[PDB]
A paper describes a structure:
Here, we computationally designed monomeric and homo-oligomeric miniproteins binding with high affinity to the MERS-CoV spike (S) glycoprotein, the main target of neutralizing antibodies and vaccine development. MERS-CoV S comprises an S1 subunit, which mediates binding to sialosides via the N-terminal domain (NTD) and to the dipeptidyl-peptidase 4 entry receptor (DPP4) via the receptor-binding domain (RBD), as well as an S2 subunit which promotes virus and host membrane fusion to initiate infection,12–17. We show that these miniproteins broadly neutralize a panel of MERS-CoV S variants, spanning the known antigenic diversity of this pathogen, by targeting a conserved site in the receptor-binding domain (RBD). The miniproteins directly compete with binding of the DPP4 receptor to MERS-CoV S, thereby blocking viral attachment to the host entry receptor and subsequent membrane fusion.
The best interface motifs (according to ΔΔG) were grafted onto new backbones using MotifGraft32 and designs that bound to the biotinylated MERS-CoV S EMC/2012 RBD via yeast-surface display were subsequently optimized using site-saturation mutagenesis to identify affinity-enhancing mutations. The process yielded three constructs, designated cb3, cb4 and cb6, with respective binding affinities for the MERS-CoV S EMC/2012 RBD of 3.7 nM, 61 nM and 44 nM, as determined by surface-plasmon resonance (SPR). Superimposition of the RBD from the crystal structure determined here with that of the computationally designed complex reveals that the cb3 miniprotein aligns with an RMSD of 4.8 Å for 57 aligned Cα positions. Out of the three monovalent miniproteins designed, only cb3 had detectable neutralizing activity against MERS-CoV EMC/2012 S VSV, likely due to differences in overall binding affinity which is an order of magnitude greater for cb3 relative to cb4 and cb6. The neutralization IC50s and binding kinetics for all three monomers are included in Table S2 and Table S3, respectively. cb3 broadly inhibited MERS-CoV pseudoviruses harboring all S variants from our panel with up to 4.5-fold reduced potency for the United Kingdom/2012 isolate, compared to EMC/2012, most likely due to the L506F substitution within the cb3 binding site (full curves for each replicate in Fig S1). Our structural data suggest that cb3 binding to the RBD would be incompatible with engagement of the hDPP4 receptor. Subsequent local refinement of the region corresponding to two neighboring MERS-CoV S RBDs each bound to a cb3 module yielded a reconstruction at 3.2 Å resolution that was virtually indistinguishable from the crystal structure of the monomeric cb3-bound MERS-CoV S RBD. These results indicate that oligomerization enabled retention of the binding mode designed.
Numbering used by the authors:
A (entry chain A): 381 to 588
B (entry chain D): 3 to 59
Amino acid sequence: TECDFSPLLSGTPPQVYNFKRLVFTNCNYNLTKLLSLFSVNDFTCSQISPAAIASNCYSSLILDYFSYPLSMKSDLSVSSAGPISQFNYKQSFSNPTCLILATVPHNLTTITKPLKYSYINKCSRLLSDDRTEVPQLVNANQYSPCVSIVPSTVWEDGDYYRKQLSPLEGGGWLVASGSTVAMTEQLQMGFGITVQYGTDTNSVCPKL
Amino acid sequence: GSPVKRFVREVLEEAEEAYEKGDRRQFEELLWLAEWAARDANDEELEEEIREFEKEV
Ligand SMILES: *[C@@H]1O[C@H](CO)[C@@H](O[C@@H]2O[C@H](CO)[C@@H](O)[C@H](O)[C@H]2NC(C)=O)[C@H](O)[C@H]1NC(C)=O
Ligand SMILES: *[C@@H]1O[C@H](CO)[C@@H](O)[C@H](O)[C@H]1NC(C)=O
């Protein structure tokens, strides 16, 4: 049973704050077959090397993927305190991980382009009694609380969004703002890999 | 004219509806949202527009 990466290869990839997640157990992977379809621009890992990530056996392998501009590479890193890791996408700190930035070649026609790149630059709770703003930072392996009020594609750089909260939720506002980056000639994407070693069977192994 | 001005002006339109319907709590909640956004964007002209709105309402 081979791990099936094919969902990634069909459709317009979401923006980073709507990252799509594939979860693999009890299968055999060929990371080369997947990456050879793309022009890989950057392949960086934490707690493991790029050579080891494609050669070890895991209890699970998680692959997140999204449209993402290469020009924002420095914001997509385990070392970054910028708006991507604060409000959009944060990988586990306790498991080995990789981040791959790749370009979609013109002959990969089943991966289609959104009209632009978008990301959340602010997600905050407003507290009415104190008139204070509290940033809502994203948790590892979770979506921003603001994914409900930020559109799948931001219309104009700097747009603002809101939802009113009930007294049962603490009242006040949930507010957000979005940013845009112009689409590139070929689509650029980010891939986030998270692996675990298990006290159970390591049933996610490389295809021999 | 700009993302924050469009956002605030939409919020102030809802505030006028709340105040005309007698929902003073909702009016204040919306005014605070509008004031927060204008200050978040460092739009001092828009802050003055919200003041004139509050006076005129
Ligand atoms: C056509 O598709 C092939 C793959 O089938 C593309 O080849 C990859 O291109 C990138 C960038 O040049 C390389 O880093 C990969 O290693 C290539 N893969 C292989 C297996 O060689 C090719 O670029 C595509 N051509 C066009 C015109 O889009
Ligand atoms: C993995 O994929 C590469 C690239 O297509 C292929 O050449 C290689 O034979 C594969 N390895 C397997 C199936 O063990």
